[PDB]
Amino acid sequence: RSIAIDSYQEDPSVVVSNFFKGVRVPKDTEFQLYKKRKQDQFVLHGENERLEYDGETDELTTKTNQYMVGLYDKQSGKINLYRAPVVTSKIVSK
């Protein structure tokens, strides 16, 4: 045999709580889960036929600030916000 991975869920679903041996939690008990705001770090790679493009986010900036790309409507006065990484990149020949 070999155990087949049918599905893998990376985003929060279940929680394993650790109390004490023989714990009894009433069936009616309702719980909430809270996640610490921890912003992602990225690497960007690009390839042309002639050139190579390579960049990364700044570790400290990732801790201090967030960047949003916005699509603003002059007429309606409405904005659509999108959180985005800002990667500083280099171009190198092949």
């Binding site: 045999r1 070999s2 155990i3 087949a4 991975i5 893998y8 869920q9 990376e10 985003d11 929060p12 679903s13 279940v14 929680v15 394993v16 709580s17 650790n18 109390f19 004490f20 041996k21 023989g22 714990v23 009894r24 939690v25 069936k27 009616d28 008990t29 309702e30 719980f31 909430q32 889960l33 809270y34 996640k35 610490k36 705001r37």
Partner: protein
């Protein structure tokens, strides 16, 4: 109640098949694995479900495997409660229970560890 200043509630909790648990056919597992293994890239886990101690190939690295539930230390896991999101509002969690109304327990617990090295 107010959570820590830098914690935000998880309000979009993904589904877990509660129903698949009461049936004789399915086993509920817990796996302790090194953080450096990218599970998403794996297609299979060649764990030997009969062995207490084994070895497993992942990527191109050497990992020891220990079926904790096969030792006297890992036989009792009644201290561990599985909280599942309710089908009503996947914004709140409740303890997983059976027809016996006593908390759901892990059938198997596996630990995957790196082999000893001298960095």
């Amino acid at each position: 109640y107010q959570p820590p200043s830098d914690y935000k509630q998880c309000k979009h909790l993904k589904s877990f098949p509660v129903s698949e648990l009461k049936g004789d056919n399915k086993e509920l597992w817990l796996m302790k694995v090194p953080a450096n293994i990218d599970i998403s890239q794996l297609k299979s886990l060649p764990l030997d479900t009969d062995a207490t101690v084994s070895t497993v190939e992942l990527g191109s690295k050497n990992f020891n495997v220990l079926q904790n539930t096969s030792t006297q230390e890992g036989s009792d896991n009644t201290n561990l409660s599985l909280l599942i999101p309710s089908e009503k509002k996947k914004e709140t969690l409740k303890v997983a229970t059976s027809k016996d109304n006593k908390s759901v327990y892990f059938d198997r617990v596996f630990t995957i560890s790196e082999t000893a090295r001298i960095p």
